[PDB]
Design an enzyme around this catalytic site. Structure first.
Site, PDB file in Angstrom:
ATOM      1  N   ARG E  54       1.054  -9.959   5.154  1.00  0.00           N
ATOM      2  CA  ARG E  54       0.030 -10.925   5.557  1.00  0.00           C
ATOM      3  C   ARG E  54      -1.075 -11.062   4.521  1.00  0.00           C
ATOM      4  NH1 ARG E  54       2.773  -9.207   9.808  1.00  0.00           N
ATOM      5  NH2 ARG E  54       2.806  -7.410   8.366  1.00  0.00           N
ATOM      6  N   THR E  55      -1.638  -9.932   4.102  1.00  0.00           N
ATOM      7  CA  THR E  55      -2.837  -9.989   3.265  1.00  0.00           C
ATOM      8  C   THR E  55      -2.555 -10.640   1.924  1.00  0.00           C
ATOM      9  OG1 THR E  55      -3.732  -7.996   4.329  1.00  0.00           O
ATOM     10  CG2 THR E  55      -4.778  -8.753   2.294  1.00  0.00           C
ATOM     11  N   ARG E 105      -5.475  -4.528  -3.482  1.00  0.00           N
ATOM     12  CA  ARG E 105      -5.218  -3.521  -2.463  1.00  0.00           C
ATOM     13  C   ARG E 105      -4.663  -2.289  -3.179  1.00  0.00           C
ATOM     14  NH1 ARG E 105      -1.754  -4.384   3.034  1.00  0.00           N
ATOM     15  NH2 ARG E 105      -3.828  -5.247   3.528  1.00  0.00           N
ATOM     16  N   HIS E 134     -11.345  -2.690   4.932  1.00  0.00           N
ATOM     17  CA  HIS E 134     -10.457  -3.844   4.929  1.00  0.00           C
ATOM     18  C   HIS E 134     -11.284  -5.065   5.340  1.00  0.00           C
ATOM     19  CE1 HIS E 134      -6.981  -6.236   4.894  1.00  0.00           C
ATOM     20  NE2 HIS E 134      -6.174  -5.548   5.688  1.00  0.00           N
TER      21      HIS E 134
HETATM   22  O1  PAL Z   1      -1.186  -1.743   8.046  1.00  0.00           O
HETATM   23  C1  PAL Z   1      -1.810  -1.874   9.141  1.00  0.00           C
HETATM   24  O2  PAL Z   1      -1.312  -1.402  10.199  1.00  0.00           O
HETATM   25  C2  PAL Z   1      -3.131  -2.581   9.217  1.00  0.00           C
HETATM   26  C3  PAL Z   1      -3.383  -3.473   8.041  1.00  0.00           C
HETATM   27  N1  PAL Z   1      -2.370  -4.474   7.952  1.00  0.00           N
HETATM   28  C4  PAL Z   1      -2.476  -5.611   7.101  1.00  0.00           C
HETATM   29  O3  PAL Z   1      -3.460  -5.765   6.367  1.00  0.00           O
HETATM   30  C5  PAL Z   1      -1.377  -6.616   7.159  1.00  0.00           C
HETATM   31  P1  PAL Z   1      -0.335  -6.532   5.674  1.00  0.00           P
HETATM   32  O4  PAL Z   1      -0.141  -5.107   5.247  1.00  0.00           O
HETATM   33  O5  PAL Z   1       1.030  -7.165   6.082  1.00  0.00           O
HETATM   34  O6  PAL Z   1      -0.986  -7.323   4.489  1.00  0.00           O
HETATM   35  C6  PAL Z   1      -3.624  -2.704   6.789  1.00  0.00           C
HETATM   36  O7  PAL Z   1      -4.591  -1.911   6.780  1.00  0.00           O
HETATM   37  O8  PAL Z   1      -2.896  -2.834   5.766  1.00  0.00           O
END
Ligand code: PAL
Ligand code: CTP
Ligand code: CTP
Ligand code: PAL
Ligand code: PAL
Ligand code: ZN
Ligand code: ZN
Lengths: 310, 145, 310, 143, 310
Positions: E54-55, E105, E134
């Site tokens: 997602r991010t 990230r 985050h």
């Molecule tokens: O991973 C999680 O459970 C919460 C959170 N999730 C997200 O940000 C969504 P993603 O990892 O798909 O970009 C994170 O801290 O990375």
């Protein structure tokens, strides 16, 4: 009791010329007249924490020839040291409650010495500790030099290959230095040179030695050409330029060798001795290995039996 | 620096060695009164260090351990304000516990044993031979714990 | 025949107080007066499918002390079970045509019991089956408690560490419960508590036991402090919080210990017993391990020789 | 008594020697006098360090408030105390401390450590500039 | 210039209520009226040293919707940091000579803050740094809560699951605590509780929070039920008992929910939200995900443009 009765056999540096001669005299006697029940009712541990073919199998064969039983392991992976995190100290502390002697080989220098500090009254025999000492190799080596040269003094001895990490040459040099008038030629890559503590000992005793960059330089004068394997499992990655044998002995290099000269090698060899050497009359490394039985029988007899054999 | 009634005075310590002696032999790990002068004038050495430890005494062996850092120091034993004994460290046969073998493949690093080295004079330096691995080193490269 | 002649020795739960006492009486006799040829002409399999130092080596040493020969393996990797897919059942079916007894350790609970169903008339001795039973540990343990305490009844016994997976304490608790008036203290993390089937058995016999969160709580009253290793190779990943020893015994914790108190540990230890304990007079785990010889000699003698020893 | 320099007084027992190490105080040619386990009126036992012709850096003074809060720093010239105070606590401490968060980026990378120090009776708090985690200075002193 | 122009976006702790409101207002406007050329001629680095769906994808989609170009990597394994030993500091030092902003990230806490020390005038946007912060998740979270609830104050907010390692709830709690009269319910395993520094913050501001061992305890009260994933890649092995979701939301648990309650989850979910929840009117985690586009567009627009007019 004989001088070696119940003694730890850790380092040639701890033994005297008299001790070495005692082992060899006993070896001669047992070879001439076997005593298949001498160590009847002994049980001896054979504990190898790194690889071995000759040392372990000749040691165990020698135990059986003298009528002793054998327990142990040829690798540590299925001991409780290997799987449950046990120290070497606790390992020796328990094994020393079972057996009459402990034969051990170990990848860390000083392991046999440490074992003596936990083995109570049970003798420890060093079958090799890292790149440090290999006293029973030296005993069979001395026996072989004696057999082929008729003496252990006033010899010209070349040692070739990995001298820095060869526990074999550390022990053998210290041993030959206890006899009179021997002269050494060291043929090694600079990175794998004979350690300074050995050189100092030679200097202190006034023993002649010199460095040489080729085997041919000294071939005409050597009585014993002691070849060695590069100890690749001990090398720092910084020393990987020397993994390949720098000195390769072939049959043709033996043209100017003295008639009495023997080629020795504690083995295993890689390519530092070409197979064509095997058929020449100077090749004596397999004979040398077979002498391990007589030397190791003698040592066990001396350590475990209070009277001198006859 | 001021006199003591009872204990040990390590006098005539070379400059920059006093602190090393306190660190290495853990001399300050005690409740006894300690008095230290560093960079004191000597008129014999130029500069000297001085360690006074009350109600504490050093055996010949403990005094000898000092030989590797302050071979020409003077160890004064004191009782009822009097110097009842003067001794100079002589080089010991062994150095146990405080040093670490520089051989990374030495068994002494993995197992519950105390370090131990044979001491000898070589070419006007001190060589240390590990009881375990039997490798030998200049005392300079043999680090403390 | 003696009551244990040709018997399988799988679980303490299958043995009576009389059986246990018979092993110990026989152990005492053989220790006082060795019989080096008692099991002459026996060949015994030593089959270890998981790691061991003490159990395998003391068992094999005991076989040699009684004059028996030994075949087997210290790991399964180079058996046909390890490389060609053979079942344990077929493994036992063939080995039982070779040998006079089978000593086996195995990572799955119930393996020794299963082996008895394929071994025909060849006795199986359980050197440990998963986290289930360890009857020969219990025999040497009982021998050691007896030697040091003068009796096996009316004792205060603390057991510390991983009680859930300790085959050692499963067997030892069942064994001590067969004697009169013993009292138990269980000092364990909640996740590794003594199993209910053991607790029920104690209740049913009216034996007192209690849980404690510290060693110091009971130090003043214990005759035997039985320390254990966390059986990390048996833990579910859900139980990894308990990998590190929760109770560490040091020399200073022994200030209020009774003079007669011994510290036992089936070994190997990690850090649950600090090395400073080793020199104290309460430390008896190495002595305990050495008693494995006498217990295991006794058991082999009883199983393989029809008459009682004298 | 000394003519000019610093006397660090009222140091807790078993702290004097630590200070010598950390501040590298003995790495000088200046005359030094040290008393360990001295009798003290207000403290019972104390450590005492005298350094001639020498004054603590601003860094060392800041670090002193952590290691020895109730210690006394005396500044001296012409045999007289011309300055006497307990070391001023700073709100930020750099370089010397180590973040106890093992997954902090500050362990792997070429940056100086940094903590926001917050006097917080009882234990003084240290917040890492990078991971933003906060710890008792009791725990951070495990460098 | 707008208050966020050329600002690093590292931690919610560095942002004010007005800052958050500005992003939300800007996000609402861009959703209602797209600005496809707002960031034309911008090149933005997307640097993910840790997994993401997602991010990363919403961030990059957002850049494209505003007309910016994108460079970077979704894995560090083929960068010079991955294969040539390069530090993160150096990595940022060079990339910040190429691009107008850096989205990053990273698996360690503090990585984004460190980047700001080597990025010069190039703003760094923290897409997640270890288990610390985050910020952009919180931005889209706030936006979603505002949309469904009509407000960001006087809410009843439950946070469930791994609160210790949930960078998502660290940032979200701090953000909601900048608004008035919000009340928090923390439903977590003891081993994964909301960290003390978050609690202390809530205390200093006089914000009410409480712990609960069940969702049902608070189902009737909540406006927002925020579910989280156990952060298994962050757990110490000691914490492995908590790998499985302790709290599992199912459609039937919602029977007493306020009609307008929304279930949020920053995603991905494992088992903590059953698929039968997806069809209920309370499920809003995918719509929440969708809102990442408008929050991230807003943040990018405000950071890289002095003023916006819309
Ligand atoms: O991973 C999680 O459970 C919460 C959170 N999730 C997200 O940000 C969504 P993603 O990892 O798909 O970009 C994170 O801290 O990375
Ligand atoms: N009650 C005492 C007695 C002596 N000292 C110290 O012990 C050392 C040696 O004592 P002393 O023999 O009296 O002095 P010197 O004659 O100078 O000895 P040397 O010639 O060895 O230097 C001096 O540092 C002195 O300060 C002390 O601290 N307390
Ligand atoms: N020329 C000087 C003057 C003072 N001091 C030392 O500085 C410290 C404090 O000096 P001072 O204020 O004179 O003593 P106090 O009144 O006891 O101070 P406090 O109340 O802080 O203990 C004392 O340890 C003293 O020995 C020194 O070494 N040299
Ligand atoms: O390994 C060598 O090259 C020499 C020497 N070799 C032997 O002892 C023969 P083996 O390893 O087969 O017992 C040794 O140090 O182990
Ligand atoms: O492993 C233990 O901690 C206890 C016990 N230990 C032993 O039997 C000793 P070993 O594994 O060396 O034979 C066991 O159950 O295997
Ligand atoms: Zn060493
Ligand atoms: Zn940090």
């Amino acid at each position: 009791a004989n001088p070696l009765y119940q003694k730890h056999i850790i380092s040639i540096n701890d033994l005297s010329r008299d001790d070495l001669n005692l082992v060899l005299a006993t070896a001669a006697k047992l070879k001439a007249n076997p005593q298949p029940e001498l160590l009847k009712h002994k049980v001896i541990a054979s504990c190898f924490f790194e690889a071995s073919t000759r040392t372990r199998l000749s040691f165990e064969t020698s135990m059986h020839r003298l009528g002793a039983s054998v327990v142990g392991f040829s690798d540590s992976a299925n001991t409780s040291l290997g799987k449950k995190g046990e120290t070497l100290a606790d390992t020796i502390s328990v094994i020393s409650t079972y057996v009459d002697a402990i034969v051990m080989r170990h990848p860390q220098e000083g392991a046999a010495r440490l074992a003596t500090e936990f083995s109570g009254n049970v003798p420890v025999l060093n079958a090799g500790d890292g790149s440090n000492q290999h006293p029973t190799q030296t005993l069979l080596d001395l026996f072989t030099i004696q057999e082929t040269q008729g003496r252990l003094d006033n010899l010209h001895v070349a040692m070739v290959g990995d001298l820095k990490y060869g526990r074999t040459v550390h022990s053998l040099t210290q041993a030959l230095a206890k006899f009179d008038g021997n002269r050494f030629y060291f043929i090694a890559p600079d990175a794998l040179a004979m350690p300074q503590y050995i050189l100092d000992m030679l200097d202190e005793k006034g023993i002649a030695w010199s460095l040489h960059s080729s085997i041919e330089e000294v071939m005409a004068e050597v009585d014993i050409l002691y070849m060695t394997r590069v100890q690749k499992e001990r090398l720092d990655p910084s020393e990987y330029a020397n993994v390949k044998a720098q000195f390769v002995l072939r049959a043709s290099d033996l043209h100017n060798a003295k008639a009495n000269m023997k080629v020795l090698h504690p083995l295993p060899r890689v390519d530092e001795i070409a197979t064509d050497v095997d058929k020449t009359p100077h090749a004596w490394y397999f004979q040398q290995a077979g002498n391990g039985i007589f030397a190791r029988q003698a040592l066990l007899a001396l350590v475990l039996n209070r009277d001198l054999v006859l | 620096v001021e006199a003591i009634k009872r204990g040990t005075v390590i006098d005539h310590i070379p400059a920059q060695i006093g602190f090393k002696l306190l660190s290495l032999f853990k001399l300050t790990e005690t409740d006894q009164r300690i008095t230290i002068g560093l960079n004191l004038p000597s008129g014999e050495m130029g500069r000297k260090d001085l360690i006074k430890i009350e109600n504490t005494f050093l055996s010949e062996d403990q005094v000898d351990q000092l030989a590797l850092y302050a071979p020409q120091a003077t160890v004064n034993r004191i009782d009822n304000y009097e110097v009842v004994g003067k001794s100079r460290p002589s080089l010991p046969e062994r150095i146990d516990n405080v040093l670490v073998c520089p051989n990374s493949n030495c068994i002494s690093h993995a197992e519950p044993v105390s370090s131990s080295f044979a001491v000898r004079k070589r070419a006007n330096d001190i060589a240390l031979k590990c009881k375990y691995c039997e490798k030998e080193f200049s005392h300079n490269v043999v680090l403390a714990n």
